[PDB]
Structure 1
Amino acid sequence: IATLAPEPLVEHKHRTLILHLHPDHPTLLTTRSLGSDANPTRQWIERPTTVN
C-alpha cells in the first residue's frame, strides 16, 4: 500500500501549465514532452512549491 500526494492545483496560461504542488511527503514529479525531444524533467518536491 502506497500514498497519494494531494492532487496538484493546476492552472493554465499561454502554452504553459503551472502546477501548485503541496507535497505532504517527499514526492517525485516527472514530466516529459511527447515530441521528438523528450526533454525529461525529474525532481523531488519536499516543501510546497509552484512549477511552470
Structure 2
Amino acid sequence: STCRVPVARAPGVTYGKRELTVKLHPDHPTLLTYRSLGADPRPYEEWIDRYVE
C-alpha cells in the first residue's frame, strides 16, 4: 500500500565561507541527515523536535 506522509518545510540556509547554517522548524520529530561526498564521509544523525540551529 502507499501512505501519505508529511513533507517538512525547506530549511533556511545562510551561506558562510565553506560553512552551512540551517534553520530547522519541525512540526514533529524530524530526521536530519547529511554526509560528505568525498573519500571519507562523516555521516550525521539527530532527531529534531524543536527549533534548532
TM-score (norm 2): 0.88
Residue 31 of structure 1 aligns with which residue? 34
Query: Alpha carbon RMSD of aligned pairs, Å?
Result: 0.7
Aligned equivalents of 1:11 and 1:4: distance in 2?
21
Identical counterparts, % of pairs = 48
| Structure 1: gaps of 5 or more residues | none
Specify which of 10, 20, 29 is matched with residue 23 of structure 2. Answer: 20
| Structure 2: gaps of 5 or more residues | none
**Count of paired positions:** 50
Q: In the alignment, does 2:49 pair up with 1:46?
A: yes
In the TM superposition, structure 1's runs of 4+ consecutive aligned residues that sit over 3 Å from their partners are none
Aligned equivalents of 1:34 and 1:16: distance in 2?
15
